[PDB]
């Protein structure tokens, strides 16, 4: 018991071309029946599966982001010279010192050292509590990579297609050309905790002139500790018989504090099953901020005798389903379908009714039995949902009582205004 | 810790006889980069030659090297090799190894001399 | 052939110790971001000098920079030294063919 739920039948009277825009992590399934001119019952199945979208980036190991707190302390000596004596801020892991050697006046003289020229004021800022917050990556270089898989008659060819690699065969050819892309070389991707929660992506990321307060001022580099300078100066505050305090007019919040003061002014990121190792960082962006352009082309010359001889026979049945009708709620069909005459052929059964068809499978059968789950979201009261090939169903159907980032394109008609509503 | 390559096997062949290259890397993970040869006549600019991925099942040739060509890497030893089928007078220079990081080159080894004359 | 080509323009006139220099690199096609400058000293090795048009090797000092717009990209010194006065190279990797350029060399005026 068949219906009318066919695929698009497309006359192989010139090429047949297509140009494909896909998004980052979205899955294509284009699927036709190529029509010999010279015979209207002469079809061959045309089936092309294209995967998601690899990010593969070359990087640079920049290091761990570490934060800290500010802290100034002042040390003064009546007599001898700053480049005599020892200051527990010299010790510590990041320390900017500025002295003031031989400057010792009155003004700022304590009550006691009644001497001019003679004593010392060092100030030194250094910090504590220095703790890794983040792990910061260098783009190098990009690339990205699809795996495709084509099904032309009883051929079946895949190859995972790359920007300097085509899937080419006798009569069909895929092309990977272009890739508009988010990330670009020369950016640092920081992830604050584990890899599949995200990450940050900074383009001023200071390298050379460093300064207490910007992206990646202290870093935990591998060789060892990486300060920064500070971003200000410094000056000598003091009153009459009284010790000479420092003071400094500068920034006090450090880089990851301003970063997570303005957190939402930077480009955020996403991932999905991530492989990091010494050189590289795989990882599929589920943002679909990315799009490939894939060109496909198959020629008229399909010799349509050698791709007629002994073809891939199907056989289908509905065996259970769960679920309800409701526009919302979603149904799960079961098929158990019989492949025969071939030993692997590419192919997608659907879950229609009488009049549509509310679902679609993808799957590579295998010669003989084959389980293959339909989910489908749609229908009515009195609709018996089965299981369907191209135009063969199953011989009987089953009825219910009361996104998933995957393309369908087969070419079907679909209903008009007849099947909404009723 | 410090990256280290060197560069052998080059001499003088006749013109029309093979030549293996070794390259012997040291002090990174030799099993995670993509591996590259580039080499250089005398007093002119750099030619990438060939390169090859991380196991070996994906290797990038020149379209002059038609099969004459083939990179080959020995992880387990940390070693890249370039075996040349019969060379021809137009193959005389230094040869690099480079560590390929899909793109630019970021190592250069010391380089040996291949000399193909009669 | 159809490849991308890297007009490097040789033959600099000298320059004095400690001024600041500019070097260009320019390209038949648009690689966007593609791009690195390479050392090559006379009679050592070539060197990675900048990565990603815009970052700066491991071992490459701070008096090294680069920038540029579409197509047309510069490598800039400042604070001359006689140590880096070699040749210069500018590498694109946006598609394949992965190509070189010609080459500049500098030359110190003392």
């Known amino acids: 018991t068949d219906t009318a739920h066919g695929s698009g039948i497309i006359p192989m009277r010139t090429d047949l071309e297509l140009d494909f825009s896909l998004p980052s992590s979205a899955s294509y399934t284009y699927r036709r029946q190529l029509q010999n001119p010279a015979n209207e019952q002469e079809k061959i199945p045309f089936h092309l599966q294209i995967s998601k979208q690899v990010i593969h980036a070359e990087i640079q190991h920049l290091g761990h982001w570490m934060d800290g707190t500010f802290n100034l302390k002042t040390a003064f000596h009546c007599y001898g010279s700053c480049e005599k004596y020892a200051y527990p801020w010299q010790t510590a892991g990041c320390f900017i010192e500025k002295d003031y050697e031989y400057e010792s006046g009155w003004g700022c003289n304590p009550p006691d050292c009644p001497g001019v020229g003679t004593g010392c004021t060092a100030c030194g800022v250094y910090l504590d509590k220095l703790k890794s917050v983040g792990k910061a990556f260098k783009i190098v270089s990009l690339r990205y990579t699809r795996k495709a898989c084509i099904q032309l008659g009883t051929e079946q060819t895949c190859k995972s297609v790359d920007s300097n690699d085509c899937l080419v065969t006798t009569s069909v050819k895929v092309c990977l050309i272009g890739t508009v892309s988010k990330f670009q070389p020369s950016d640092t991707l920081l992830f604050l905790g584990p890899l599949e929660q995200g990450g940050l992506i900074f383009k001023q990321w200071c390298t050379t002139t460093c300064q207490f307060g910007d992206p990646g001022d202290i870093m935990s580099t591998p060789v060892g500790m990486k300060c920064p300078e500070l971003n200000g100066s410094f000056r000598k505050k003091c009153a009459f018989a009284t010790t000479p305090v420092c003071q400094f007019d500068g920034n006090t919040l450090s880089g990851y504090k301003r970063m997570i003061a303005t957190k939402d002014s930077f480009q955020s990121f996403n991932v999905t099953e991530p492989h990091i190792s010494a050189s590289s960082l795989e990882w599929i962006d589920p943002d679909s901020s990315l799009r490939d352009h894939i060109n496909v082309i198959v020629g008229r010359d399909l010799s349509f005798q050698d791709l007629s001889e002994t073809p891939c026979q199907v056989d289908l049945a509905t065996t259970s389903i769960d679920g309800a009708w409701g526009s919302g709620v979603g149904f799960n069909l079961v098929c158990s379908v019989s492949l025969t005459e071939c030993s692997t052929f590419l192919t997608s059964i659907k879950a229609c009714d009488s009049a549509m068809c509310y679902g679609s499978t993808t799957a590579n059968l295998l010669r003989g039995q084959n389980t293959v789950h339909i989910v489908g979201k749609g229908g009515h009261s009195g609709s018996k949902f089965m299981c369907c090939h191209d135009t063969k169903c199953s011989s009987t159907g089953l009825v219910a009582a009361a996104d998933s980032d995957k393309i369908f394109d087969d070419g079907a008609p679909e209903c008009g205004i007849s099947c909404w509503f009723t | 810790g410090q990256v280290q390559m060197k560069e052998s096997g080059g001499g003088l062949v006749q013109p029309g006889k093979s030549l293996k290259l070794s390259c012997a890397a040291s002090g990174f993970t030799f099993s995670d980069f993509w591996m590259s040869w580039v080499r250089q006549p005398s007093g002119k600019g750099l030619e990438w030659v060939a390169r090859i991925n991380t196991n070996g099942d994906t290797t990038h040739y020149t379209d002059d090297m038609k099969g004459r060509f083939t990179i080959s890497r020995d992880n387990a030893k940390t070693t890249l090799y370039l075996e040349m089928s019969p060379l021809k007078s137009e193959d005389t220079a230094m040869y690099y190894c480079?560590?390929?990081?899909?793109?630019?080159?970021?190592?250069w080894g010391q380089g040996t001399t291949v000399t193909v004359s009669s | 052939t159809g490849d991308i080509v890297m007009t490097q323009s040789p033959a600099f006139p000298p320059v004095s110790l400690g001024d600041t220099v500019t070097i260009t690199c320019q390209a038949s096609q648009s690689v966007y971001k593609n791009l690195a400058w390479y050392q090559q000293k006379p009679g050592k090795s070539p060197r990675l000098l900048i990565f990603?048009?815009?970052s700066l090797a491991d071992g490459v000092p701070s008096r090294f920079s680069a920038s540029g717009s579409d197509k047309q990209y510069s490598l800039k010194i400042r604070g001359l030294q006689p140590e880096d006065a070699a040749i210069y190279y500018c590498?694109?990797?946006?598609?394949?063919?992965?190509?070189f350029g010609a080459g500049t060399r500098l030359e110190i005026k003392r």
């Open positions: 990603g048009m815009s």
């Open positions: 480079t560590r390929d990081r899909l793109g630019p080159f970021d190592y």
């Open positions: 590498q694109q990797h946006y598609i394949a063919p992965y190509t």
